[PDB]
Design a protein around this ligand. Structure first.
Ligand SMILES: O=P([O-])(O)O
Length: 321
């Protein structure tokens, strides 16, 4: 039995926690995962203070090479807009990218603003003031989110751009996905981006978004998987899944990566890390699904296994898988 430590992204925290828990029940191995945001997860794996790092934002091949890291995807989730609009229930408000962008730019200030009303014909929006919530900490969820907004709102692209941290035009800061969920819950008029599980687990109402193809879609597990149907994984794991074309493709979708050193100094920790993720691919699909994360197609996991053999070694050049 081994004791492993991981750290990083809160985006997959719910599933990683479940996997760890079940893994310890079934094998005795203990995986201690710390959700500190993707930014911290990357700083940590590089500082060698954990056995594996987790970031929703991929590292470039060059940067991976410069640090001696290897990254691989685990699950596919989706970022939803959680809201607290006295009167409205979940799934009923509809927004489109441009508008979502203007709300985060501080251009739209009330729920019954023309722009929103035009998008929700039958809705009776209250004239509540919108309280914008964004991440206070360095976030891979903030990266997927700002990557999507840059694609759908020109002013957002030119003035604040994309990033794990950016200069937010407006909004209160919340720490971690859980931080943002707690804020929306305590603030009438609140809107904040969170990975889907956090909205659902906390009974927070969310909106539908307009797909790249122009149709309103609900955030669900299968729609997260839809956004990924056209992803050419054979080309690379670092797949951008935001605003993808296709029927029922949720627009703010993202996979999430695990970062490990190619030259394993503590080969016993390395091996156990791989064994844990292998068990997760082989058996944790149900647990992921229960949590509304879409599993990666088998072809991709086979690619990940092949890569492990190819890239992960002890200092003797001996493969750990
Ligand atoms: O998953 P996050 O914590 O990096 O946003």
């Amino acid at each position: 039995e081994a004791s492993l430590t991981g750290a990083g992204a809160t985006f997959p925290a719910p599933v990683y926690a479940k996997w760890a828990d079940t893994y310890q029940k079934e094998t005795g191995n203990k995986v201690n995962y710390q959700g500190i945001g993707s930014s911290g997860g990357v700083k940590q794996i590089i500082a060698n203070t954990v056995d594996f790092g987790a970031s929703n934002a991929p590292l470039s091949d060059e940067k991976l090479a410069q640090e001696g890291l290897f990254q691989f995807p685990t699950v596919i989730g989706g970022v939803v807009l959680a809201v607290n609009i006295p009167g409205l229930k979940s799934g009923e408000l509809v927004l489109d990218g441009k508008t979502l962008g203007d709300i985060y730019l501080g251009k739209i200030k009330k729920w019954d603003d023309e722009a929103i009303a035009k998008l929700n014909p039958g809705l009776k929006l209250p004239s509540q003031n919108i309280a914008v919530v964004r991440r206070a900490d360095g976030s891979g969820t903030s990266f997927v989110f700002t990557s999507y907004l840059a694609k759908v709102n020109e002013e957002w692209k030119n003035n604040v751009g994309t990033g794990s941290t950016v200069k937010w035009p407006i909004g209160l800061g919340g720490k971690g996905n859980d931080g943002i969920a707690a804020f929306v819950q305590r603030l009438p008029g609140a809107i904040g981006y969170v990975e889907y599980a956090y909205a659902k687990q906390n009974n927070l109402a969310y909106t539908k978004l307009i797909s790249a193809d122009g149709k309103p879609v609900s955030p669900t597990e299968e729609n997260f998987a839809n956004a990924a149907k056209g992803a050419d994984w054979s080309k690379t794991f670092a797949q951008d899944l935001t605003n993808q074309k296709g029927e029922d493709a949720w627009p703010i979708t993202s996979t999430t990566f695990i970062l490990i050193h190619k030259d394993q100094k503590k080969p016993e920790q390395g091996t156990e890390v791989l064994k844990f993720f292998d068990w997760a691919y082989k058996t944790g699909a149900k647990q992921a699904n229960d949590l509304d994360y879409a599993s990666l197609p088998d072809s991709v996991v086979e690619q990940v296994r092949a890569a492990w053999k190819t890239n992960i070694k002890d200092s003797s050049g001996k493969p750990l898988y």
